[PDB]
Amino acid sequence: HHHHFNLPPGNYKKPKLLYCSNGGHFLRILPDGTVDGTRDRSDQHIQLQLSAESVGEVYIKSTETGQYLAMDTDGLLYGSQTPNANCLFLERLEENHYNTYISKAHAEKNWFVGLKKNGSCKRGPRTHYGQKAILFLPLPV
Known part of the structure; x- marks a missing residue:
């Protein structure tokens, strides 16, 4: 409705790491509720289980917490x-390859999940199509 409908080829059977090419960080949800990215692959808070709501809609959940x-x-x-x-x-x-995530609640504003090169999260209004910050690649845990 507000956005295209090209969907990625993957499935949600197994947990995944969401790797951001912008700075090479894995999306992380820390115990205290903060969200950022880390290059440390042994981190216990980067393992994420995605699950579907309607087609093309997902929840992203830390398997650890x-x-x-x-x-x-x-x-x-x-x-x-x-x-x-x-x-x-x-x-x-x-870009025929990566995965992007737009907040459904704020979809009309194009607010994406994105990570800066320094590993910090981008604020919704500062994200937009064409940025490397919004590009993720799911990887096996």
Whole structure:
């Protein structure tokens, strides 16, 4: 409706790491609810289980802590104990290869999940199509 519908080839059977090519960081949801990225592959908070809602919609959950990736009304990512409406993302194929995630609650504003080269999360309004920050590649755990 507000966005294209090219979907990635993967499935949600197994947990995945979401690797961001921008800076080479794995998306991480820390125990205290902070979200960032780390290059440390042995990190216990980068293992994520994705699950579907409607076709093309996913929840992103830390297998270690059970927290769901969520976006607040100012566009900031955080870890939520429960899977509310702001935990749903529109997962799409991008540049015919990568995966991108747009906040469903804020989809009309094009607020993406994105990581800066320094490993910190980008605020929703500062993301947009064409950035490397929004490009992820799911990898086996």
